[PDB]
Amino acid sequence: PLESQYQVGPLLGSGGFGSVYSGIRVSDNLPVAIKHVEKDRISDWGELPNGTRVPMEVVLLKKVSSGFSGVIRLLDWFERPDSFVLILERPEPVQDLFDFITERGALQEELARSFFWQVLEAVRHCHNCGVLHRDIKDENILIDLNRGELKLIDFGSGALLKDTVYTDFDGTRVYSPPEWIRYHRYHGRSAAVWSLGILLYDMVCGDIPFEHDEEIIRGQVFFRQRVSSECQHLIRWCLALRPSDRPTFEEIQNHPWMQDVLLPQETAEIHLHS
């Protein structure tokens, strides 16, 4: 029971998500992350197999936990008077994609591809486990710099995956698809693909392509940097205005630009200098 199992360290960051801290498991010194979430700010609750009230975040994390290292692991969690606490694996050394992109600009395509493929594989996993993330974006992807592996994080906005329409969204606006902006309705897989389209553009251009509802609704994509035509094509496809025109994951991964991906480890050697 309790903290004193773990050993709190520097705050890593905070926001509408809550607050996350570096920490060590005192027993075996495992690097972990301690994420605190206030009950008043939680909005989407669910319940466990064993039948108890919890943040959806926790349900979703348990549903997707496993060997698969494309998604952060939930190690344990605790309930408090006015908060919850989640203990998550921490890789060390680690940097999130956003910070990596600020630091290094528009990524080389070889690297964007390794990365993007890894994201794709992580998301497929979530959908295989019945979970839909709803906030795919550079900040919510961690890079394990030794192993050249990407981990997805922050399921605070996600939802059980379903085949019917979604009328709620509390993700990140600029990553949301046109059909949310206009109609306040979307379907899971097609909304995901759109945000992945924003994600790839961000990677290859050093920034997100739309900053305003107007540009989202319009959906014309302008490339501010040299980007190969296959890449441009893949991105424009993911950003088709009509959802059903977007590619499935299978089509994304069978797309020409996605051929001959580097393994994560050879990515690290070549591109993380390690």
State the binding site for ATP: 12-20, 35, 89, 96
Is 147 a residue that touches ligand R9P (CB under 6 A)? no
Q: Is residue 135 flagged as an active site residue?
A: yes
Q: For 4, left (φ over 0), alpha (ψ -120 to 50), or beta?
A: left
Per DSSP, which regions of the chain are E strands? 6-15, 18-25, 31-38, 45-47, 53-55, 74-79, 83-89, 94-96, 131-132, 141-144, 149-152, 159-160
Q: Nearest to ligand R9P by Cβ — which residue?
A: 13
Quick one: which segment of 37-45, 96-104, 182-190, 191-199 binds ligand R9P (CB under 6 A)? 96-104
Give, rounded to a whole angstrom, the gap between the first and last alpha carbons of the chain: 39
Quick one: which segment of 63-71, 118-126, 137-145, 216-224 binds ligand R9P (CB under 6 A)? 137-145
- Beta carbons within 10 angstroms of residue 272's beta carbon: 18
- In angstroms, the CA 268 to CA 274 distance is 5
Is 137 a residue that touches ligand R9P (CB under 6 A)? no
Of 37, 61, 96, 119, which one interacts with ligand R9P (CB under 6 A)? Answer: 96
Which residues make up each annotated binding site?
12-20, 35, 89, 96
Of 56, 87, 143, 153, which one interacts with ligand R9P (CB under 6 A)? Answer: 153
Cβ proximity to ligand R9P: between 72 and 205 the closer is 72
- In angstroms, the CA 105 to CA 97 distance is 11
- In angstroms, the CA 196 to CA 92 distance is 26
Of 44, 121, 139, 207, which one interacts with ligand R9P (CB under 6 A)? Answer: 139
Of 94, 181, 221, 258, which one interacts with ligand R9P (CB under 6 A)? Answer: 94
Eight-state DSSP code of residue 50: T
Residues that bind ligand R9P in the complex, under the rule CB under 6 A? 12-13, 15, 17, 20, 33, 35, 72, 88, 90, 94, 96, 98-99, 139-140, 142, 153-154
Active site residues: 135
